């Protein structure tokens, strides 16, 4: 009952106009034009009959793409590209890089211009091609295609009608963390057979992402360096290509723990006199104002919200004592309140953080790390 | 009731800020040279990360002068406390969903590496089949 | 119920001021364009453009509804988009777990099929 869509295939041979191969592609040319019934119970038959039938799955891609059918429905080619695209192989090895780039540029010029609302039209197709790239890189003989399509895939994701703080919609950022952990799963794996050029994103399309506002892709960019620190130690780092991630580690450490961020050198490359001429026009004019302000934004260690929501839960589940009296910690609010305001009264009702701030970050930095729930974000010192 | 006015006037305000902070910086390069305004994607990024970083630095001029003193400002404290308590889906209900989808994909390609070689070997026991 | 009624006008004044700054600056965009219509202008060379990444522009002026502005247009859209992206990812995971059964029962039937056909091959 569910095999005679396979023995009818095996009966004569493959790779010719048999019964099912004509049928499914005629159903695809029928489903885009809205005259047939809605395809929610037709496309499961399609995704069943077109799983790994390579002589057929190399034929829907060259037909139902590149905007010639995309403007008709688009609510179902996304589902087709969720189906066939995670299961594909190339055999025209030279005629693919000149096809997916054109295809997704033609996605992008229609994705973010008309409608003016990214209602799940671009980035899921990027996530599906990015899922395909796992299937490509897992085999051999064509990873040189994969780690050449991946870099301009990331250089097409980081155009700034998608990624930044006016409107975000998140569909850039987790597609990007998939796009980076596929590379780090390539990184941790054994049997090195590639040059270093394939696996470092470079300061034009990673220095913009690392300065974002969501915590978890900053954790993914941390996970990159904490795993690509392996296998780049073997290459001689005497100024060939490893200078780029020396720059990236020596401003991430200068950003999140080593608070020397003001009078240092060009940290992202912005020549930090920009900071001396942007800090000096903002308010709350108290004394500790240079080192307090520019340390974090929306979620990691000092100036955040995730710090105090982990610290207040941390001390309400160890010693139920005097609760915290304000919002976000700093260098000055914690000092000038909980040293000269609860010196004797409320002295030993704390988490044995006997010093000031320099040990207050550590008694949550050894809480994000060991308990494996929230993130794994440990590129502070190392 | 009286928050959708805030949201729509808000989005218009952010868009006007975003456009002005680009055009008012291209005007400098107009006035400095004579005509001389093209720049490619090598140095477009260096002009763009700065306008990322400046608006991100203006972001932290609230979490030091508005959310230290725990007031009860109706428009400006309780909405910020109800709404910046959100983005609580960042952990397991969204991060390891991205793990589980790959953990499903790995089994789905493993269940095709069998079937492809299976049919490519099952061909050779059907043409060998005499008449 | 009245603090927000003042916050409305504090928003209106500064959004009008930013509109007027944008109109004046955009009217002064094409000032030195009419002197010699070239409209390509390649040299933006590094000796003078590196100066531009050292001085900002358009500071705030303490009335500041640009402060609260950036959060209620970011942390509403982030939460809303997450609560849609979970729905789409769970839909795809449900449909692929539906497909694993329907094409893992096939890999048994074909193995036991080619076993019996190899038996008929051996008996000829």
Author numbering:
A (entry chain I): 337 to 718
B (entry chain H): 7 to 137
C (entry chain K): 5 to 128
Task: Give excerpts from the publication.
Inner kinetochore proteins, particularly members of the Ctf19c, constitute the foundation of the kinetochore; they both recognize Cse4/CENP-A and recruit microtubule-interacting outer kinetochore proteins. The Ctf3c namesake, Ctf3, is a 733 amino-acid residue protein predicted to consist almost entirely of HEAT repeats (Huntingin, elongation factor 3 (EF3), protein phosphatase 2A (PP2A), and yeast kinase TOR1 repeats). Ctf3 associates with a coiled-coil dimer of Mcm16 and Mcm22 (Mcm16/22).
We now present a cryo-EM structure of the yeast Ctf3c, which resolves the overall organization of the complex, shows how Ctf3 binds Mcm16/22, and clarifies Ctf3c recruitment to the larger Ctf19c. The final map shows side-chain density throughout the particle, enabling modeling at near-atomic resolution. As we saw in the previous Ctf3c model, an Mcm16/22 coiled-coil occupies the cleft formed by the concave surface of the HEAT array. The two main components of the structure, Ctf3-C and Mcm16/22 N, have opposite polarities; the central parts of Mcm16 and Mcm22 form a parallel coiled-coil that begins near the C-terminal end of the modeled Ctf3 polypeptide. The N-terminal parts of Mcm16 and Mcm22, form a set of four interdigitated helices that pack onto the convex side of the C-terminal part of the HEAT array and contact the helical knob.
